[PDB]
Every structure is written in C-alpha cells, then in structure tokens.
C-alpha cells in the first residue's frame, strides 16, 4: 500500500522550490491521511487533478476541499522552538492565527513557538 513517505515524495516531485507553504501542506495532508487510513484516496485525487490539467498546487488545494477528512478541519498545531525551525520559503506566509482557522480555507498549520508565540501558515 502507498505509504505516507511515498506519497509525500510523489507530491514533492511536482512542486517547485523547497520548503514552501505547499511542501508543508503536503506534510500536513500526508499525516492526517495516514492517521485516517486515507492515503489511497488522497493519492487518487492528486493524480486525477493532475490528469485534468490542474497545477500540482491546485491539486493539493482541491484535496483539502474534496477529501472529507479535511472538510472544516482545523490546522494541526506544530510545536517548535524558534521561528528558525520554519523553512525559509515559508517565512513570508506566516500570519497571526485567526479565530477558527481551517485547513480548507488555506491555514496549513499553526506553529507554536516555545516562548508562547503562535503563527499560522497561510496559502
């Protein structure tokens, strides 16, 4: 069966750059997919979007809207030490955390820094 690492690598291979907000979203999708035994449908939806001509970025966003485990789901909280634990390419996508953030509205994750600061990663 497709593993979380297999699927992350498949998705990464389609994305430009490294450590972008989309790379983080792949990680978030693959973790929630692993934990809900849903890696197969996620991979199928990804591939189908590509096959229709959508960009990989759009395909990842569509997963957040079309795979039910994501519909109205909150972003995972990711505990980190400092803002430097967040990849360079994500830094300008970091925002104050709004009320009721949702993955399917573009809130990929919330980083919680050791000093208590919290930042949402937004696409």
From Swiss-Prot:
Q: What is the effect of changing residue 95 to A?
A: Complete loss of IRF3 promoter inhibition; dsRNA-binding and interaction with host PRKRA
Q: From which domain of life does this come?
A: Viruses
Effect recorded for residue 100 to A: Impaired viral replication
Q: Where in the cell is it found?
A: Virion; Host cytoplasm
Cross-link named Glycyl lysine isopeptide (Lys-Gly) (interchain with G-Cter in ubiquitin), sites: 92
The PTM entry states: Phosphorylated by host IKBKE. Phosphorylation contributes to efficient viral replication and transcription.
Q: Where is the PTM Phosphoserine found along the chain?
A: 93, 100
Q: Where is the VP35 IID domain?
A: 1-123
Functionally, this protein is described as follows: Plays an essential role in viral RNA synthesis and also a role in suppressing innate immune signaling. Acts as a polymerase cofactor in the RNA polymerase transcription and replication complexes. Serves as nucleoprotein/NP monomer chaperone prior to the formation of the large oligomeric RNA-bound complexes. Regulates RNA synthesis by modulating NP-RNA interactions and interacting with DYNLL1. VP35-NP interaction controls the switch between RNA-bound NP and free NP and thus the switch between genome replication and genome packaging into the nucleocapsid.
Q: What does the domain comment read?
A: The interferon inhibitory domain (IID) binds dsRNA.
Assembly: Homodimer. Homooligomer; via the coiled coil domain. Interacts with nucleoprotein NP and polymerase L; VP35 bridges L and NP and allows the formation of the polymerase complex. Also interacts with VP30; this interaction is regulated by VP30 phosphorylation. Interacts with host IKBKE and TBK1; the interactions lead to inhibition of cellular antiviral response by blocking necessary interactions of IKBKE and TBK1 with their substrate IRF3.
Homology family = Belongs to the filoviridae polymerase cofactor VP35 family.
This one is known as: Polymerase cofactor VP35
Taxonomic lineage: Viruses, Riboviria, Orthornavirae, Negarnaviricota, Haploviricotina
Its gene is VP35
């Amino acid at each position: 069966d497709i593993s979380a690492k297999d699927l992350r690598n498949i998705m990464y291979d389609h994305l430009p750059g490294f450590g972008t907000a989309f790379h983080q979203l792949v990680q978030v999708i693959c973790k929630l997919g692993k934990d809900s035994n849903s890696l197969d449908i996620i991979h199928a939806e990804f591939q189908a979007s590509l096959a229709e001509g959508d960009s990989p970025q759009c395909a990842l966003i569509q997963i957040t809207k079309r795979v039910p485990i994501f519909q109205d789901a909150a972003p995972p909280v990711i505990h980190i030490r400092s803002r430097g634990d967040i990849p360079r390419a994500c830094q300008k996508s970091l925002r104050p955390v709004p009320p009721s953030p949702k993955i399917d509205r573009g809130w990929v994750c919330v980083f919680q820094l050791q000093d208590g600061k919290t930042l949402g990663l937004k696409i």
